[PDB]
């Protein structure tokens, strides 16, 4: 655990420790990958039902005559899960109220598409940058720790002057 | 007896008085003529901290002719044949009898640091050096860790 | 042994043990850093799945009402299947369910146009939302890893 205690440890046992760590790491890594795959799955599932509901709130917003109705629809489109549940009852109350089966409007709809298009292109760019950063970061910090360990190694300094 | 064994002996005193950092070498107590060596992979190279052992085989035409030098430890380097032979110019085409065992070992660590893909002995390593540098440093690193036995 | 001496046989094994520790430490730091990224992913799975059960409840509610306002058998069938609470069916029928909402939620050729438009909007939002959740998870991972290495580096710093 410390360099002095390693000098105290025995040299075959250090190899056995290295392979204990290698196989523990491989376990942990298959575990990490399973976890991430689940997390991506639930997140895309959530992303999809949220997309359904905030898109719904915008159209039902368009059909509301009451200031409060429009307020609820807009707060829902904000896309916060907690608020969405809480306002769910009033939103259905609103949907029941307005469910009973021009030019400028399509213009807005396509404006929002382009804005989102631009938002998604950006979000993708920043995701790419974030992944790069994690990798850079693990590498940067590991390097500093390697250097610290080398600088407190005495065998090193006596082998090299 | 001869001047060759005495030149080997001057090389020894050289190692004892001025041992280059991260190298060691000594001939068998009986046979001044054969030498155990070892290089340590310098810092900041992918061979960092390795403890590679080396065999030097001399004869009676030295310092005129160099010894044959081969790594004993398992190796992975573009300038190393699968049998230890080393593709170094100072040993194959630019030798000078002024060179001693110390100088020879120092040049080999210089090579651990500067692989020469232009005279590739081991193909796999000269390629991985250029195509898959991460797979290369992984290969070399498992080499370094087996060297510790 | 003194530096003005040739490296002896004990010295070699000592250097190798210190190098062995440094290798162990590196694989141990890398492993505990992985430990933290995994514990974080587990927490986020718990959180997103809580959120998904809740919003699926909302979807099931929505599906019962649109089921009620349906004229054609196929529509009613889709609505009932969604009201079942299946997580894969909602993904697959996301477009047809959105079209059904737009058709019944509201009191010629322009209506069909606005339906096409808002289905596209829902799908761009689904993408924006995925990318938003993944970027949030990514930044939580960067934050956790910074907190992990910084602490080891500071233990070392006080070890002067």
Shared-domain flag, residues A95 and A123: no
Q: What is the token pair recorded at C137?
A: 């998870």
**Does some domain include residue C4?**
no
Which of C97, C95, C72 lies closest to C82, judged by CA?
A: C97
- Residue pair C63/C76 in contact (Cβ under 8 Å)? The answer is no
CA distance linking residue A30 with residue C102, whole number of Å: 43
Given A55, A71, A101, which residue is the final one in a domain?
A101
CA distance linking residue C10 with residue C14, whole number of Å: 6
Cβ pair A150:B21 closer than 8 A:
no
CA distances to A42, A82, A84, C52, C55 from A76, in Å: 21, 10, 6, 16, 12
- Residue pair C118/A59 in contact (Cβ under 8 Å)? The answer is yes
Nearest to A156 among C18, C23, C98 (CB): C18
CA distance linking residue B29 with residue A161, whole number of Å: 27
Shared-domain flag, residues A20 and A63: yes
Cβ pair C135:A156 closer than 8 A:
no
Q: How was this structure determined?
A: X-ray
What's CA C50's distance to the chain center, in Å?
A: 13
Shared-domain flag, residues A63 and A113: no
Residue B133 burial by CB count (10 A; 0-12/13-18/19+): exposed, middle or buried?
exposed
Shared-domain flag, residues A96 and A108: no
H-helix or E-strand spanning residue A130: helix A103-151
Would you please indicate which residues of B are annotated as catalytic (active-site) residues? 87
**Does some domain include residue C20?**
yes
Measure A71 CA to nearest chain C CA, in Å.
18
Report the relative pairing of strands B51-57 and B23-27 from DSSP bridges. unpaired
CA distances to A84, A90, A95, B123, C58 from A68, in Å: 15, 10, 14, 75, 21
Which of B98, B101, B90, B99 lies closest to B9, judged by CA?
A: B101
CA distance linking residue B68 with residue C98, whole number of Å: 79
Measure C12 CA to nearest chain A CA, in Å.
9
Given A53, A74, A101, which residue is the final one in a domain?
A101
Shared-domain flag, residues A112 and A42: no
**Does some domain include residue C14?**
yes
Q: Within 13 A of B5's CA, how many CA atoms are on the CB side?
A: 8
DSSP assignment, residue B35? E
Nearest to B22 among A11, A150, A159 (CB): A159
Q: The domain containing residue C140 runs over which residues?
A: 9-158
- Residue whose structure tokens are 């110019």: B89
- Residue whose structure tokens are 């009033």: A90
Please give the full DSSP string across B40-103, using - where no structure is assigned.
EPPTTSTTTT-EEEEEEE--SSTTTSPPEEEE-S----TTB-TTS-B--HHHHTS--TT--HHH
Helix ranges, chain C (H): 9-68, 73-83, 87-104, 110-158
Shared-domain flag, residues A59 and A75: yes
Shared-domain flag, residues A47 and A86: yes
Q: The domain containing residue B143 runs over which residues?
A: 1-149
Shared-domain flag, residues A21 and A95: yes
CA distance linking residue B126 with residue B119, whole number of Å: 9
Helix axes A11-62, C110-158, angle to 10 degrees: 150
Q: How long, in residues, is chain B?
A: 149
The domain tally of chain C equals 1
Shared-domain flag, residues A115 and A125: yes
The domain tally of chain B equals 1
With left for phi above 0 and alpha for psi between -120 and 50, is residue A93 left, alpha or beta?
Answer: alpha
H-helix or E-strand spanning residue B24: strand B23-27
Nearest to A47 among C45, C101, C129 (CB): C129
CA distance linking residue A43 with residue C56, whole number of Å: 13
Residue B43 touches chain A, beta carbons under 8 Å: yes
Q: What is the token pair recorded at C72?
A: 């054609």
């Amino acid at each position: 655990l410390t360099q002095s205690d390693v000098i105290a440890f025995q040299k075959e046992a250090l190899f056995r420790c290295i392979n204990r760590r290698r196989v523990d790491f491989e376990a942990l890594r298959k575990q990490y990958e399973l976890s991430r795959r689940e997390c991506i799955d639930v997140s895309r599932k959530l992303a999809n039902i949220m997309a359904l509901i905030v898109t719904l709130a915008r159209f039902i917003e368009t059909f509301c005559t009451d200031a409060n109705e429009k307020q609820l629809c807009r707060e829902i489109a904000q896309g916060d899960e907690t608020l969405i549940v809480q306002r769910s009852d009033s939103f259905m109350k609103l949907l029941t109220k307005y469910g009973k089966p021009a030019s400028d409007h399509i213009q807005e709809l396509t404006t929002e598409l382009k804005n989102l298009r631009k938002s998604k292109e950006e979000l993708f760019y920043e995701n790419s940058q974030l992944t790069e950063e994690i990798s850079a970061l693990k590498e940067y910090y590991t390097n500093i720790i390697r250097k610290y360990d080398r600088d407190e190694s005495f065998t090193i300094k006596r082998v090299f002057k | 007896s001869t001047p060759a064994r005495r030149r080997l002996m001057r090389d020894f005193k050289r190692m004892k008085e001025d041992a280059p950092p991260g190298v060691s070498a000594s001939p068998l107590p009986d046979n001044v003529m054969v030498w155990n060596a070892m290089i340590i992979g310098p810092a900041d190279t992918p061979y960092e901290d390795g403890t590679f052992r080396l065999l030097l085989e001399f004869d009676e035409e030295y310092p005129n002719k160099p010894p044959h030098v081969k790594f004993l430890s398992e190796m992975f380097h573009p300038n190393v044949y699968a049998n230890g032979e080393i593709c170094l110019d100072i040993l194959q085409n630019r030798w000078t009898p002024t060179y001693d065992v110390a100088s020879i070992l120092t040049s080999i660590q210089s090579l651990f640091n500067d692989p020469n893909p232009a005279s590739p002995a081991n193909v796999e390593a000269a390629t991985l050096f250029k195509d898959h540098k991460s797979q290369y440093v992984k290969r070399v690193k498992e080499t370094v860790e087996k060297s510790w036995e």
